[PDB]
Design a protein around this ligand. Structure first.
Ligand SMILES: OC[C@H]1O[C@H](Oc2c[nH]c3ccc(Br)c(Cl)c23)[C@@H](O)[C@@H](O)[C@@H]1O
Ligand SMILES: OC[C@H]1O[C@H](Oc2c[nH]c3ccc(Br)c(Cl)c23)[C@@H](O)[C@@H](O)[C@@H]1O
Ligand SMILES: OC[C@H]1O[C@H](Oc2c[nH]c3ccc(Br)c(Cl)c23)[C@@H](O)[C@@H](O)[C@@H]1O
Ligand SMILES: OC[C@H]1O[C@H](Oc2c[nH]c3ccc(Br)c(Cl)c23)[C@@H](O)[C@@H](O)[C@@H]1O
Ligand SMILES: [Ca+2]
Ligand SMILES: [Ca+2]
Ligand SMILES: [Ca+2]
Ligand SMILES: [Ca+2]
Ligand SMILES: [Mn+2]
Ligand SMILES: [Mn+2]
Ligand SMILES: [Mn+2]
Ligand SMILES: [Mn+2]
Ligand code: NA
Ligand code: NA
Ligand code: NA
Ligand code: NA
Lengths: 237, 237, 237, 237
């Protein structure tokens, strides 16, 4: 199995597998069963922003999800990532729909990782930023249903040519380069990610969610990971 | 009185005013009496590095102080900085000697502050980096005894022309521009600082310490802030 | 007199003092009489963007001014800036109106300066970015008529409470910190600036222009610098 | 054939194929026959630094190669890179030896590419920085003889376990991710690279050189590209 750490924007409460009884954001460490969650007043049809951060000194993975003038939902979790992840990883975005559906539309995404070693200059750095997506994003590994559209958006899950979301979809986008997310001689390892997103749905209870995740480099969509497993895990353990 | 938040590298245990009984690093919020400390195996005559970070989501101010191959001392403290500091601040370095003495030599210093508001692009940013100091550092406000030397170092406290440290010294260096360190509409406010330093001393128990601090914009060295008060506070309350 | 290098967005052709006979962008080195100009299809009432760059190896100061889908005007000039400017400068924006008028509204501004010396890490850096302006921009030196408005814009020249531009106005905004724009031991010195702007006017021939400029640190608006002298020069020599 | 743009640090004058009669730096556009060269006072056994820059407004590709206190060699060339390179590229370092030999040791490498579109925020960015190299650099495509060593250096050409350079060697290292180096709607495209290097040799006339290059994404070492062709070209046309 892969090794996964994620920030989930989970629109659909799957209380049979431990979700709280509301839409929520969560921090996931090697399980769909979040280690920490917060209530999320998700707003269909409005552009949201997520900002995720972590550093190895603080050892606190945090996320905030906002809609302008609209709400600010925050979650954090204390964890030593170096003890969980391999030292080389790929970073990505995932999304699913199930019986119920929603767009999982990414409008922009940025990511920064640093390793520091007793200088004002980083010992290692990686940064990428997209404020739109090309028709042929050569620096993305697209998995499952994920595609880019004529508007420059990344559609993680399937949408029809009219823009309507489809059920039973899974898709992911990984940055092409492996990231050296920790190294045993570094003094500090830190990372930050931001993305903006648009979730539209006609459904009473839109589903299922989208995530930013960090994984082993050769990560692939697990078999059986549609709907409530957000394209990340093979089961609900 | 000024309003001060600091990371102290405190070489001299002043147990009468609450220091632990060893050299230590500490996080100071409006008092010399640190809110959190860690033991510090300080090494005279070796170049050290300090890395300080905070973000408004995590609400955890952290520092790590290292000497290569030598030791890694870390301290953190959970606090909401926006509720403590004014929204405009100056950032700086301070140092003192007292009866006992040490160089408080800064070899490099960098600082980054960001404000983010629902885009992959910062809503506001400030960054500065010095890997050496000019003879006339026009972007620094030098206070007290602080000066730059012919080697490109910032000598926060007095040193003789042979390089020997002097007692009863206080000095500070502030970045010239005010920094907008938080703002009530921002989704996230974050800052990072790094500096490298050299503390030499002939004394059995070198004193007194050096700090990175954040203050009201018009901050000045308090009267009576030499030695154990590290140039930051007018008393030990 | 001050020492000035500027990029001018010159809406009004003052052919008596050497302007071409059209609105134009220009590179100005110690004179209002541009060293290089390009025709500018300026569009009142639309948001424009300017990007300015220079590096000491290439020795080519360049600017591009764009309106989305609208036009792209570019100018460059080969010059060794280190031989013209003092090693410490302030950077700023200036604007004027004269008999004829226009808003000189700045919506965002960023600036980066680097000094490099045989490492992958900069020897010195300064960066600032504003994507809006506070009511009390403590890190700006406002000169003349320049003010910030309730919308978060910087109004370099006077506008009425209805937003109508006024004639015979001059204003400038400088970044608070001096910038070490070159240093004799650096291998490379480089700088980049971006701003976005909005020029509205009811006038047949809107006037007079706005600039990004670099000057001696103590620069002030010259006497007699309204209208065609864009707040930068005391005469048209 | 591949499509190549390079900055060459050419230690060995191959005057039969157009080199000047001295060690030199050069800018290469689709040929080994440099479009522009400068004399280079190369210093065996000393660490050097190269800084390379380009932007689409200025249209001037420049390089400077320095040894501290030692010499500063600069070359530039006016060219519109968007008309030469594909819009997606890989970036890399190459080196060769031939009959005569030298180490082609890279100690650090950084690279930044930006695309800007009428905001203070980049429309697209990629940055990477290595201040040393891992034993298994998962974000590098190593070609030919290139390897990383136990000291954290990248040895582009073969060296023995005692550190002695070998003849008839070719090697390259490419960054794993493709780079979107230009795009037809961008207002500006810019890139910067820095690396530090160490060239040791016992030979009277050390050979052959090392380069930073930009190529089509699927670039490979051409057959017959050892020695004077610096691993980049299949012939001397
Ligand atoms: O998309 C929402 C959910 O739809 C499905 O689960 C169901 C939620 N409501 C239901 C109602 C009926 C039945 Br049948 C099923 Cl499986 C479900 C499953 O696909 C879940 O994995 C998914 O989280
Ligand atoms: O520099 C170390 C310290 O020296 C002084 O306190 C003393 C430490 N040891 C002593 C021994 C004797 C006497 Br007298 C004095 Cl005040 C002290 C004071 O200046 C303190 O503020 C300072 O922390
Ligand atoms: O704002 C545009 C210009 O208005 C003035 O110059 C004039 C341009 N057209 C005119 C027409 C009449 C007279 Br009177 C005057 Cl001074 C001028 C002067 O204020 C110029 O400096 C300025 O460039
Ligand atoms: O490494 C230096 C050079 O060595 C070779 O060319 C020669 C330079 N001096 C010579 C002297 C003798 C002979 Br045989 C040969 Cl091929 C050469 C060839 O391998 C060249 O491609 C290379 O630039
Ligand atoms: Ca769920
Ligand atoms: Ca103390
Ligand atoms: Ca004019
Ligand atoms: Ca050659
Ligand atoms: Mn959940
Ligand atoms: Mn203390
Ligand atoms: Mn003009
Ligand atoms: Mn050559
Ligand atoms: Na878009
Ligand atoms: Na130094
Ligand atoms: Na605005
Ligand atoms: Na090294």
């Amino acid at each position: 199995a892969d090794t996964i750490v994620a920030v989930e924007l989970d629109s659909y409460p799957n209380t049979d597998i431990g979700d709280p009884s509301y839409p929520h954001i969560g921090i996931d460490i090697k399980s769909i069963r979040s280690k920490s969650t917060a209530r999320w007043n998700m707003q269909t049809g409005k552009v949201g922003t997520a900002h995720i951060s972590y550093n190895s000194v603080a050892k606190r993975l945090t996320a905030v999800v906002s809609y302008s003038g609209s709400s600010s939902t925050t979650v954090s979790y204390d964890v030593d990532l170096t003890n969980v992840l391999p030292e080389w990883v790929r970073v990505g975005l995932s999304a699913t729909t199930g019986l119920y559906k929603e767009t999982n539309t990414i409008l922009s995404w940025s990511f920064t990782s640093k390793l520091k070693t007793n200088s004002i200059a980083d010992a290692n750095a990686l940064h990428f930023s997209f404020n739109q997506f090309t028709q042929n994003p050569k620096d993305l590994i697209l998995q499952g249903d994920a595609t880019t559209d004529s508007d420059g958006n990344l559609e993680l899950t399937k949408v029809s040519s009219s823009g309507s979301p489809q059920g039973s979809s899974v898709g992911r986008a990984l940055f092409y380069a492996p990231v050296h997310i920790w190294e045993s001689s570094a003094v500090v390892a830190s990372f930050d990610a931001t993305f903006t997103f648009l979730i539209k749905s006609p459904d009473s209870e839109p589903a299922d969610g989208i995530t930013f995740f960090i994984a082993n480099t050769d990560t692939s969509i697990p078999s059986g990971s549609s709907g409530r497993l957000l394209g990340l895990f093979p089961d609900a353990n």
